[PDB]
Design a protein around this ligand. Sequence first.
Ligand SMILES: CC(=O)c1cc2cc(c1)C(=O)N[C@H]([C@H](O)CNC1(c3cccc(C(C)C)c3)CC1)Cc1cccc(c1)OCCCCN2
Length: 377
Amino acid sequence: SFVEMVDNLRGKSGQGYYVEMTVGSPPQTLNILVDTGSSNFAVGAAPHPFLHRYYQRQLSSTYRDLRKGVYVPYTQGKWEGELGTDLVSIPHGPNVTVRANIAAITESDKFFINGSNWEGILGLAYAEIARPDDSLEPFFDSLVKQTHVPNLFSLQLCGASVGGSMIIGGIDHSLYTGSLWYTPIRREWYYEVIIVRVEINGQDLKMDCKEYNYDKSIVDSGTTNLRLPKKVFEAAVKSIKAASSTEKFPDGFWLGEQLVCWQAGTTPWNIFPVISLYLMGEVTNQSFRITILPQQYLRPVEDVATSQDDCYKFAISQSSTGTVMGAVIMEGFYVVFDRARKRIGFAVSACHVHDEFRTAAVEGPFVTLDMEDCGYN
Ligand SMILES: CC(=O)c1cc2cc(c1)C(=O)N[C@H]([C@H](O)CNC1(c3cccc(C(C)C)c3)CC1)Cc1cccc(c1)OCCCCN2
């Protein structure tokens, strides 16, 4: 019955994927950003320059005030508001209605995006990282308790403006090719995984694999970039610089500040390497790898000049909070969040990025010794 949910995500490139939801009685309709890197369901509830509509508690005959304040700070950008509950639906989702916690955003800073077309956020992670504390049941925990929807969901994000699918409660086998490869969820707070090996153009980075997961590695649909721990980032940028030394780039390009442009249709794709992330498998000593093409970590942007040059931002950035496999990483793939079986599945998506001679891939099995030593404590 999942075809009703196929293609239910829209977005403007780099500004997040959203699904359509209704809250309150009568139903008020909002576009909600789908975020696996947080756990709070929150909507705008007061006018804002970048909001074209918002939740009106006054008009919902099912609203209930919880008389507690709340705030969530993200990587950068933050909001505060007032907790409450109300009935919630997903028109292009399962045909159910749940009473769910909602934070009515009343003040915010650098959170809403000009022209993103979404007005709220759906944190799909676990209660442990909910604010103010872990006793505020996140939306998906409420959905699974109060209905018969099974405890998993899958995301198919398609690159560029953009679209995709959120299959709530199951797997749609027509959204991927090949087999699904699963990696354990190490701890139920973020969607935390263990990268066990990293290769660039088939060349192992040869780092202590604890470096890959220092201090964590997570799957985060709410962040554009692939974010790497400092030492892994420096190692990776060195190998990408070397592979593409045929041409010259500003050093501010490697920091994500300056674009790079080529005459339309002449992007030298062949000089940027593929990146392989090996993920811990489901059986002893076993792993699988996902291959990222340059078309995923060179994200397209708007031409600053009056040209039709193709221009790109570098979407690999340095991190101090661990590895983030962001929307950039997820676009090649169908990603199953099998909460019921504590695992995350990857497969090549039906809408996979296309290179002339290379292809994104999910390949296995691989044998990897001592995968347990790769998690950071
Ligand atoms: C580089 C940068 O600055 C940056 C860039 C991007 C997102 C975020 C930060 C961002 O902050 N994205 C948040 C996610 O939740 C982030 N998740 C993490 C996080 C960080 C701090 C605190 C928490 C708690 C609250 C669980 C969680 C775990 C990483 C969710 C989010 C908030 C506001 C707008 C968003 C998206 O759309 C923008 C489109 C995507 C743009 N790309």
